[PDB]
């Protein structure tokens, strides 16, 4: 849950590094490069 | 491999915790785990 600049891969193209504000979404960063997102989010995360 | 840059974190750590991992076990593991490549060793006779 960090900005895409943190994900730095020291080799090959880094698709999870680009970012750009989106017009019709809160003027916030949107990667918009992947096609399928499969995941199982944590049931109850508390952060800090 | 882990893409960490903090010198303090990468220097103030260790592969095994010592007191929770006896050195004899470390020697046995480190020397038994060889004789097979963990990169290309997969051949499964014929079929990988």
């Amino acid at each position: 849950l960090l900005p895409f600049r943190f994900y730095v891969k020291e080799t090959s193209p880094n698709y999870l590094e680009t970012a750009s504000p989106d017009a019709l979404y809160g003027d916030k960063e949107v990667n918009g490069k992947f096609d399928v997102v499969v995941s199982n989010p944590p049931f109850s995360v508390d952060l800090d | 491999q882990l893409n960490v840059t903090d010198e303090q974190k990468i220097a103030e750590d260790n592969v095994i915790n010592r007191n929770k991992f006896p050195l004899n076990k470390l020697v046995y593991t480190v020397q038994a785990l060889e004789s097979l490549s963990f990169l290309e060793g997969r051949n499964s006779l014929d079929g990988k």
Binding site: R5, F6, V8 | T5, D6, E7, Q8
Partner: protein
């Protein structure tokens, strides 16, 4: 006079390694947690 060279003393004696500069082939590098705009990060005079 020696400010250009005494700055390196404090900037390198630190442990957090936020930034670091070289007298030769200036790469004026700093942490990825800082924005990395203009993409060059080369020593362009005393301004850098």
């Amino acid at each position: 006079k020696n400010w250009q060279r005494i700055v390196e003393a404090k900037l390198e004696q630190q442990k957090h390694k936020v930034a670091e500069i070289s007298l030769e082939n200036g790469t004026v590098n700093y942490s990825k947690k800082i924005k990395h705009n203009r993409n060059l990060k080369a020593l362009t005079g005393d301004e850098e």
